Design an enzyme around this catalytic site. Structure first.
Site, mmCIF file in Angstrom:
data_model
loop_
_atom_site.group_PDB
_atom_site.id
_atom_site.type_symbol
_atom_site.label_atom_id
_atom_site.label_comp_id
_atom_site.label_asym_id
_atom_site.label_seq_id
_atom_site.Cartn_x
_atom_site.Cartn_y
_atom_site.Cartn_z
ATOM 1 N N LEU A 93 0.699 -1.094 0.091
ATOM 2 C CA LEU A 93 0.150 0.085 0.267
ATOM 3 C C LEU A 93 0.689 1.208 0.154
ATOM 4 C CD1 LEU A 93 -2.933 -0.863 2.287
ATOM 5 C CD2 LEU A 93 -3.046 -0.217 -0.196
ATOM 6 N N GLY A 103 -5.687 -1.266 -5.801
ATOM 7 C CA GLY A 103 -4.850 -0.093 -6.311
ATOM 8 C C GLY A 103 -5.368 1.040 -5.663
ATOM 9 N N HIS A 104 -4.566 1.782 -5.572
ATOM 10 C CA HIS A 104 -5.070 3.150 -5.119
ATOM 11 C C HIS A 104 -5.588 4.158 -6.189
ATOM 12 C CE1 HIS A 104 -3.631 3.151 -1.080
ATOM 13 N NE2 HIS A 104 -2.262 2.956 -1.440
ATOM 14 N N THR A 129 -10.560 -0.171 -5.073
ATOM 15 C CA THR A 129 -9.617 0.663 -4.431
ATOM 16 C C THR A 129 -9.567 0.901 -3.038
ATOM 17 O OG1 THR A 129 -11.541 1.946 -4.886
ATOM 18 C CG2 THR A 129 -10.064 1.891 -6.609
ATOM 19 N N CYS A 130 -8.590 1.580 -2.705
ATOM 20 C CA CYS A 130 -8.261 1.462 -1.241
ATOM 21 C C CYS A 130 -7.552 2.797 -0.762
ATOM 22 C CB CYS A 130 -7.365 0.341 -0.866
ATOM 23 S SG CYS A 130 -5.699 -0.193 -1.958
#
Length: 183
Positions: free
Chosen positions: A55, A87-88, A174-175
């Site tokens: 991350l 994925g961001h 997403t994160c």
């Protein structure tokens, strides 16, 4: 347009993929190459023992607020029933940013495909759901089919594509934007 280290590194790994260089010798955690049609999602995908390490670490295992696309620590094979990749939503319009493109109804109705490249093979996943807001282990078809009708309904638009328990499903999270593709 903003150029920085993270954009330089990723565009160079993309170049090493075009040249057919083995990425896993750069990172043992490398798994496969992921790309989504009509997006800039064209990145490497890695796997750790957890869903947190990559991350903030780039592909070279250095600090990076962009991170690296990584696959759920629980996935095992390309024959898994639901393969999940995180994925961001970087604001350079990079990483999983273009998933928001699947909020455009016209874009959704257009068939843009999820493409996994693994050992000189190309798997195509057809997007059937996109929605704003995660099981990999399905103890039988019932749960897996319940999971299919579960996410086919959450989709902001209805996809013409019909998925069932005999297809395999990829998931990009997403994160939070989430889309799903089937094979």
């Amino acid at each position: 347009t903003k150029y920085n280290h993270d954009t330089k590194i990723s565009s160079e790994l993309q170049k090493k993929e075009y040249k057919k260089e083995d990425l896993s010798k750069i990172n043992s955690d490398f798994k496969f190459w992921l790309s989504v049609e009509n997006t800039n999602i064209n990145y490497p995908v890695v796997q750790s023992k957890d869903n947190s390490y990559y991350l903030d670490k780039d592909f070279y295992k250095k600090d990076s607020i962009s991170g690296t696309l990584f696959m759920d620590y629980r996935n095992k094979s390309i024959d898994d029933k639901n393969i999940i990749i995180y994925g961001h939503n970087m604001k350079n319009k990079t990483m999983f940013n273009n998933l928001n493109k699947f909020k455009d109804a016209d874009f959704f109705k257009k068939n843009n495909k999820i493409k996994i490249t693994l050992n000189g093979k190309e798997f195509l996943y057809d997007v059937f759901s996109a929605y704003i807001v995660l099981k990999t282990n399905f103890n039988n078809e019932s749960d897996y089919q319940n999971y299919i009708n579960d996410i086919t309904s959450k989709s902001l638009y209805k996809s013409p594509i019909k998925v069932n328990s005999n297809d395999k499903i990829v998931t990009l999270s997403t994160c939070a934007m989430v889309i799903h593709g089937r094979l």
